[PDB]
């Protein structure tokens, strides 16, 4: 039992796709330099720590996806599989049945130069609620003012206000591996 109110997912027509997506070049570690979405909330009192997401291409060309976060003095690892979708740069979630209440999952790479930065859009339906987020990925933990403002502009263009747009604080634990 619950009640909740969410900013609606934008139509997919407002979400560009990186042209000529190169899956081999997108591999490796990305830091989450910026975070936005309808279930993302700024918390000034206990700000979000930076985490990292590693993309490894398997032999079948799906990604093994591992996220690592520092929490409760430990490194927590989350693993999922991204299965190539309708066009290059889009993915759906492998083994969706193993996740209760999850009926829909989409990933679209919005833009990337592969060696410094990226913006990725995620949309899912979980317990019948439609969630979305955008990640600003960094090859390093810091990015230019220009790339952060572009990320803000894009997030706002999808209906998100500033208090749904977070810039996680760089840390050293867990994510420098
Ligand atoms: C626990 C707690 C705090 C936490 O540490 N969350 C992290 C875990 C580490 C990966 C980053 N991330 O998105 C988190 O949620 O999170 C939660 O209880 C719930 C419910 C949890 C349900 C399952 N879930 O949301 C997952 O994300 C499951 C596995 C994550 C690995 C997949 C690859 C991640 C790539 C995307 C990325 O780079 O961020 N999820 C969330 O709060 C966040 C906020 O919005 C979303 C979300 C929204 C739309 C689409 C995808 C989403 O993950 N998840
Ligand atoms: Fe999540």
Curated annotation (Swiss-Prot):
GO CC terms in record: extracellular exosome; extracellular region; extracellular space; specific granule lumen
InterPro entries in the record: Calycin, LCN2/LCN12, Lipocalin, Lipocalin_CS, Lipocln_cytosolic_FA-bd_dom
Tissue: Detected in neutrophils (at protein level). Expressed in bone marrow and in tissues that are prone to exposure to microorganism. High expression is found in bone marrow as well as in uterus, prostate, salivary gland, stomach, appendix, colon, trachea and lung. Expressed in the medullary tubules of the kidney. Not found in the small intestine or peripheral blood leukocytes.
Outcome of mutating residue 133 to A: Strongly reduced affinity for catecholate-type ferric siderophores
Carbohydrate attachment residues: 64
Molecular function as annotated in GO: enterobactin binding; identical protein binding; iron ion binding; iron ion sequestering activity; protease binding
Subcellular location: Secreted; Cytoplasmic granule lumen; Cytoplasmic vesicle lumen
Binding site for a carboxymycobactin: 51-53, 124, 133, 137
Binding locations of enterobactin: 105, 133
Effect of residue 124 to A: Strongly reduced affinity for catecholate-type ferric siderophores
Cross-referenced Gene3D superfamilies: 2.40.128.20
Main localisation: secreted
Induction comment: Expression is activated by the oncoprotein BCR-ABL; BCR-ABL misregulates expression via the JAK/STAT pathway and binding of STAT5A to the promoter. Induced by insulin.
Keyword terms, alphabetized: Apoptosis, Cytoplasmic vesicle, Disulfide bond, Glycoprotein, Immunity, Innate immunity, Ion transport, Iron, Iron transport, Pyrrolidone carboxylic acid, Secreted, Signal, Transport
Protein purpose: Iron-trafficking protein involved in multiple processes such as apoptosis, innate immunity and renal development. Binds iron through association with 2,3-dihydroxybenzoic acid (2,3-DHBA), a siderophore that shares structural similarities with bacterial enterobactin, and delivers or removes iron from the cell, depending on the context. Iron-bound form (holo-24p3) is internalized following binding to the SLC22A17 (24p3R) receptor, leading to release of iron and subsequent increase of intracellular iron concentration.
Listed name of the protein: Neutrophil gelatinase-associated lipocalin
Phylogenetic classification of the source organism: Eukaryota, Metazoa, Chordata, Craniata, Vertebrata
GN (gene name): LCN2
């Amino acid at each position: 039992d619950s009640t909740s109110d969410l900013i609606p997912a934008p139509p997919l027509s407002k979400v560009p796709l990186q042209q000529n997506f190169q899956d081999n070049q997108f591999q490796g570690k990305w830091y989450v330099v910026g975070l936005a979405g309808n279930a993302i909330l700024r918390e000034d009192k206990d700000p979000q720590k930076m985490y990292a997401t590693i993309y490894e291409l398997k032999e079948d060309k799906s990604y093994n996806v591992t996220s690592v976060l520092f929490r409760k003095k430990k490194c927590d690892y989350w693993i999922r599989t991204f299965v190539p979708g309708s066009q290059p740069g889009e993915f759906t979630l492998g083994n969706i049945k193993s996740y209760p209440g999850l009926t829909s999952y989409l990933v679209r790479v919005v833009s990337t130069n592969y060696n410094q930065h990226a913006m990725v859009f995620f949309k899912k339906v979980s317990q019948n609620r439609e969630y979305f987020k955008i990640t600003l990925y960094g090859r390093t933990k810091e990015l230019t003012s220009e790339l952060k403002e572009n990320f803000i502009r894009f997030s706002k263009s999808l209906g998100l206000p500033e208090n749904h747009i977070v810039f996680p604080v760089p840390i050293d634990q867990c994510i420098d591996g």
